[PDB]
């Protein structure tokens, strides 16, 4: 089906896994010579960078939250609130 960027119910905040994962995923890419979206103020470690990309919410990723029925929701690192 899908689901409108409106009408979604899932938590407005990022699951500790999402975050935990997002970073990993990005780091992995970063580490594979992907494009860096922040000023590596000296920083040379990927998962370090990620923690940074993710803190300026400059990560170009989208979390696809699935539902017990198959329908899903779509959130962007940008949107999602990173409390934790």
């Amino acid at each position: 089906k899908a689901i409108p960027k409106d009408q979604r119910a899932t938590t407005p905040y990022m699951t500790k896994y999402e975050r935990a994962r997002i970073l990993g995923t990005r780091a992995l890419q970063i580490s594979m010579n992907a494009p860096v979206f922040v000023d590596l103020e000296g920083e040379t470690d990927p998962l370090r960078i990620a923690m940074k990309e993710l803190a300026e919410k400059k990560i170009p990723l989208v979390i696809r939250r699935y539902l017990p029925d198959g329908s899903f929701e779509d959130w962007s690192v940008e949107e999602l609130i990173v409390d934790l």
């Binding site: 539902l67 017990p68 029925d69 329908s71």
Partner: protein, 107 residues
């Protein structure tokens, strides 16, 4: 409803399901000396319309099966006289947060 005392005949009872729509139930006298519903341990349940149910269902994005069930002959089940399909909403107390809404479809 039919409150038999000690029993009904295996010949008798063989005519309870022979006249539908209308349906008939059999209850033992001794089996109704006390109300089970009244028991400390038992939480009150409630029936649902083919609306409230079809609602509950759509509202949780559920198929019929995925729902928790209650025995057709369950003590409470007969007290309210369910039907292979109707849904019961059980609202009981909780040491984690006052109340807790739970449902049981019937098999």
């Amino acid at each position: 409803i039919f409150v038999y005392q000690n029993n009904i005949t295996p010949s008798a009872m063989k005519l309870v399901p022979s006249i539908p729509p209308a349906t008939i139930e059999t209850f033992n006298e001794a089996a109704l000396v006390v109300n089970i519903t009244h028991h400390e341990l038992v939480p009150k349940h409630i029936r649902l319309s083919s609306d409230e149910k079809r609602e509950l269902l759509k509202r949780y994005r559920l198929k019929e099966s995925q729902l928790p069930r209650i025995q057709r002959a369950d003590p409470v089940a007969l007290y309210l006289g369910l039907k292979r399909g109707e849904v019961v909403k059980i609202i009981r107390k909780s040491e984690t947060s006052g109340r807790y809404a739970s449902y049981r479809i019937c098999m």
